């Protein structure tokens, strides 16, 4: 959990509009969020992991224990239940809400941090370099 720690800066995207229409965000509100470029700050206060994202249109932050479900409000403002576990090198997050599901894998790949999001075959890939 050392090689995730740090501030991260978005350098490529792929299908983030598609993924978002799948999670069900509105046309207008989907475009404006798609403009902005979130970063990703990841800290480790003792054993409580904090992941912040400092995008333009909305800032967000979550704090959790690895493998303990918790509640969050995601940037698109869904109220979800989610759990995050260090799964075979990656930091995998499941989010369950209104009978639906999605997975956010965060693996290191080279000096980068790759993020696969999937909701029913529809999958999006953002990439980050250490800022």
């Amino acid at each position: 959990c050392d090689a995730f720690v740090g501030t991260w800066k978005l350098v490529s995207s792929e299908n983030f509009d598609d993924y978002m229409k799948e999670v069900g965000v509105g046309f207008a509100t989907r475009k404006v969020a798609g403009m902005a470029k979130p970063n990703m700050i990841i800290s480790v206060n003792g054993d409580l992991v904090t992941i912040r994202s400092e995008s333009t249109f909305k800032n967000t932050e979550i704090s959790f224990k690895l493998g303990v479900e918790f509640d969050e409000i995601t940037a698109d403002d869904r109220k979800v239940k989610s759990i995050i576990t260090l799964d075979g090198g990656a930091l995998v997050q499941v989010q369950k809400w209104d009978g639906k599901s999605t997975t956010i894998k965060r693996k290191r790949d080279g000096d980068k941090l790759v993020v696969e999001c999937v909701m029913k075959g529809v999958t999006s890939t953002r990439v980050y370099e250490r800022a």
Epitope: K9, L10, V11, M35, K37
Partner: antibody, heavy 120, light 113 residues
Framework: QSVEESGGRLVTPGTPLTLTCTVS????????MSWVRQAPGKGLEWIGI?????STYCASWAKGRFTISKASTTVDLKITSPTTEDTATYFC?????????????????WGQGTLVTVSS | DVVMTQTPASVSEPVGGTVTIKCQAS??????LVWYQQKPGQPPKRLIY???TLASGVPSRFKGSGSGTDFTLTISDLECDDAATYYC??????????????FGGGTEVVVER
Amino acid sequence: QSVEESGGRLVTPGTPLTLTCTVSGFSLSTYYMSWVRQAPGKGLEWIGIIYPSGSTYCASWAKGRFTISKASTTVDLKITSPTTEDTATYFCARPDNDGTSGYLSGFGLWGQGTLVTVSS
Amino acid sequence: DVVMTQTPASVSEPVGGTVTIKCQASEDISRYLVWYQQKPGQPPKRLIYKASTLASGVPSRFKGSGSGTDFTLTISDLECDDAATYYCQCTYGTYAGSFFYSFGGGTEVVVER
């Protein structure tokens, strides 16, 4: 703690030209370097940056016309086929980060510029 | 291939007064934006980086604001010394196989007296 350009002179259109930044007080295996140009009475144009690993990006318009190599303690900008548009003062500069050794806080160190004049 | 757009091109203001210049990025670039001052013949000096952080030994009369696409430098207590031409630069680096280090077209400040 210092960089300095040299090699600017009069060339005729077409003949290649090499400018040279020379550094002192830091290592090129730690720091990025970049070249910026400014024609007289005009704006700053960013040419391209060179990473400590030797990798290189150039502005969109620069591709084809410039090239940036580095050595021990020099960084060279090769202008490949000068045109009269390429007449300008060529600064050399050093990007850093929040303290040092990156690029996101922009340029903290410049040379005084070397004037290139292209004309027959 | 990002492009920065300063306004206004020129502006005059009396000593002790206040100016406001503005930058607009064509894309979102987060808070990665630096402001330079250039006096004629000299190379530029870095004033403000990270959109709002003050570089070493720069007076707080200089206030950098903005985020995402629209930033503003603001100079108060305008001193005679502040007469120069101010450039804004995108310092976000890599994005999508490109590199984003472009300068603003520049804004000249005239200090009336």
